[PDB]
């Protein structure tokens, strides 16, 4: 256990304190692990070099600790103009293990800086053989980044982040990249010029639980392969929580397979309230799916295909058995149908004792051997 004041750490809202927070996880890490705490205040910060050297550069056995999220603060000095992936992150090219950070705020200061700035990032190589290992990020605040809040990336194995929040980044509040046996849990994340939550590059065997986007500048959630012709997220459990009031959908499932999606309330978004686009073996149970299509005509739930033959995988996603069971779906004065198919080879969905109401109409399917009951 280290308190950075001890190692010249101001926490002045002026001072750069970089060096001397960075000398204290040094000083943990050579004692082979332990807590940097960080008492109330605001510790400005300066990159630390190039953008993958970010700004505090975590190790192995190493946590930071502040005195609550907004008591301390860290944040991004007025003027810096680079790019900085990650203000706390892991060494790139490093598996580094049992390390994280809990009750404080991570401040881009994108009003007074340029450069594209992630609040959190760590990770092994993309599209290389290793990982990160043992993450733990609870009641952290990430807010005001040029770029993306949480960014967990490619690999990152038994991640945990729970009770925390990202709001007003230029990008997602919380991504998750290539996470595998991860949670992300009871985290709120608003205001993001883009995504609340996105789930992207072969994410698999994620449970994401309870937790709330709303007034995002696109999707609440969204579950995606990416732009690169990878393995594909599976296997994801989206238990409970909110969705709503975002730009676009508050769910959206996209080029991804073995998704279920249960007990949530999704409602006031722009598009769709859940649109599966090209994927196959998803579950939608139990929501309470209503008031969307706020600005388009369009289902309270929709059902397509994804065609990327002209894309990076020549691939047709052709989308097969959704399960759409025991869910109360409302329309908005805008809502097409309650549960919609396009007529694009989408296939087998299977509509099982869903309550469907206030919409132009209530259920239209195409495939062949999709079915509908109750
Ligand atoms: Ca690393």
Redesign the pocket.
Known sequence: DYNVKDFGALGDGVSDDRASIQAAIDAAYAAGGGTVYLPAGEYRVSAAGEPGDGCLMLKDGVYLAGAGMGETVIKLIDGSDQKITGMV????????SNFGMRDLTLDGNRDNTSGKVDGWF???IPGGD???RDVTIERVEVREMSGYGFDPHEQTINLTIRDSVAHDNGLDGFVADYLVDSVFENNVAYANDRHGFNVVTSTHDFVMTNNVAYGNGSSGLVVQRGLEDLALPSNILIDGGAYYDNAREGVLLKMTSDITLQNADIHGNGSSGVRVYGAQDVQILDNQIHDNAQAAAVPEVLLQSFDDTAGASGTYYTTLNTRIEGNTISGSANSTYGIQERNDGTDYSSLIDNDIAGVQQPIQLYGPHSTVSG
Request: glycine fraction near 22%; hydrophobic fraction near 15%.
């Open positions: 992150r892991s060494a790139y090219g490093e598996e580094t760590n990770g092994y290793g990982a990160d």
